[PDB]
Amino acid sequence: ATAGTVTVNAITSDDVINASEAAGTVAVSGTATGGDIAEGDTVTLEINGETYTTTVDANGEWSVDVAGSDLAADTAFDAVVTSSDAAGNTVDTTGSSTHTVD
Ligand SMILES: [Ca+2]
Ligand SMILES: [Ca+2]
Ligand SMILES: [Ca+2]
Ligand SMILES: [Ca+2]
Ligand SMILES: [Ca+2]
Numbered sequence: 001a002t003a004g005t006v007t008v009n010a011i012t013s014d015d016v017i018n019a020s021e022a023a024g025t026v027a028v029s030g031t032a033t034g035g036d037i038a039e040g041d042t043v044t045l046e047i048n049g050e051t052y053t054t055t056v057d058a059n060g061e062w063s064v065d066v067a068g069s070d071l072a073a074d075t076a077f078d079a080v081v082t083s084s085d086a087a088g089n090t091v092d093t094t095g096s097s098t099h100t101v102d
Contacts, residue, residue: 006095
C-alpha cells in the first residue's frame with residue numbers, strides 16, 4: 001500500500017482564527033489523493049489533544065467540524081489518512097497545517 005498526498009486548506013479564509021471564530025465551530029478541510037487513498041478512508045486530526053475524524057469523499061476531499069477554541073489553542077496539527085490496498089495492507093499518509101490565532 002502506497003501513501004498519497006494529504007493537504008489541508010487554509011484555516012478559514014485568511015488562515016487566522018479570530019476571537020469570533022474561536023467562539024464556535026470551524027470547518028477544517030483539505031484533499032486526500034494519490035497512492036492507495038480512496039473514498040471512505042478515514043482522516044484523523046489531533047487539535048489541542050482532541051481527536052477529530054472524518055472520511056474521504058469521492059472527489060478526494062474531506063471536511064471536519066472542529067471547535068474554534070481548539071484551533072485557538074493549537075496552531076499546528078497533522079491530518080493523517082489511513083488507507084489499505086486490495087490485499088488489506090495499510091498505509092498512513094500525513095499532511096501538515098499551521099495557522100495563526102489573532
Ligand atoms: Ca495554513
Ligand atoms: Ca479567519
Ligand atoms: Ca498541535
Ligand atoms: Ca492580535
Ligand atoms: Ca487584529
